[PDB]
Design an enzyme around this catalytic site. Sequence first.
Site, PDB file in Angstrom:
ATOM      1  N   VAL A 105      -2.006  -2.256  -3.510  1.00 37.52           N
ATOM      2  CA  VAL A 105      -1.698  -3.224  -4.550  1.00 37.52           C
ATOM      3  C   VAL A 105      -2.153  -4.594  -4.058  1.00 37.52           C
ATOM      4  CG1 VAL A 105       0.068  -4.228  -6.047  1.00 37.52           C
ATOM      5  CG2 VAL A 105       0.293  -1.849  -5.325  1.00 37.52           C
ATOM      6  N   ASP A 118      12.510   7.109  -8.685  1.00 40.41           N
ATOM      7  CA  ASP A 118      12.240   6.379  -7.444  1.00 40.41           C
ATOM      8  C   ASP A 118      12.992   5.052  -7.427  1.00 40.41           C
ATOM      9  OD1 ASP A 118      11.123   6.336  -4.904  1.00 40.41           O
ATOM     10  OD2 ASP A 118       9.143   5.723  -5.472  1.00 40.41           O
ATOM     11  N   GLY A 121      -3.285   4.269  -2.687  1.00 40.30           N
ATOM     12  CA  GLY A 121      -4.222   3.210  -2.369  1.00 40.30           C
ATOM     13  C   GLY A 121      -3.483   1.928  -2.041  1.00 40.30           C
ATOM     14  N   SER A 138       0.821  -1.207   0.000  1.00 42.60           N
ATOM     15  CA  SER A 138       0.000   0.000   0.000  1.00 42.60           C
ATOM     16  C   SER A 138       0.857   1.261   0.000  1.00 42.60           C
ATOM     17  CB  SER A 138      -0.940   0.007   1.208  1.00 42.60           C
ATOM     18  OG  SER A 138      -0.212  -0.138   2.416  1.00 42.60           O
TER      19      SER A 138
END
Length: 268
Positions: A23, A126, A21, A17
């Site tokens: 996964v 990222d 939201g 998460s």
Amino acid sequence: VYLDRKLLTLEDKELGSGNFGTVKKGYYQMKKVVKTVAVKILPALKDELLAEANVMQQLDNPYIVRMIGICEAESWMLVMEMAELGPLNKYLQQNRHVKDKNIIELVHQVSMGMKYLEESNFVHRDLAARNVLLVTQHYAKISDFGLSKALRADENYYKAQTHGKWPVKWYAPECINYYKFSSKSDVWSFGVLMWEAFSYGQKPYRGMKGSEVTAMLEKGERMGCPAGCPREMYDLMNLCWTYDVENRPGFAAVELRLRNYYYDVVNE
């Protein structure tokens, strides 16, 4: 690009998460087979997902988590390939007997994926061990393209303006100081990823604040060599952490250095 909700089954297994939201593990029925998938489930969140989807659609390489497609149901859903063994940092934490050769193998795979992204003129933004996922103990893929950007045809960097959650301990000096992200900025992150991997999933700059990292780096100080890390790999790490972008290697040269050393270790 769009998927059939009738062909998609969502399990009770939450994989992870974030702010977006969650996964969840899922199943997508194909022509003859059923494919295990990971599903990202969510105005701001929707536009980011559609951006993430358009980024992922253009991308086709063995060392990246591919997107299957998108589905609009109770929420917006991004359906992606499943990497069952999970994040590299957690795997190495739980599997301390993983061999040096094996780590080299996995980080080399990440560099191949990043080499492709660089060739494709996409910046990841990222790149960390937590976002590299294992299909097998000998097969890694790059994931989480939430902050990723397709570079403009006339520019080798992306300039950010307003921001939120930034993984500073993975970010190059040009990112922190000028909000400028290039493929060489991902190379810096790759160096930190390498450090993580050879530290068997330890967090970088332990116990330190973002600002304390900045001061450390301006002193020319870098994280030390992890225990059991080969000198050739620590040297590549430090080269990735070259302060000046112009002198920092690109992923092509990084991948080559990793490819050569891996085969040297393979012959032992």
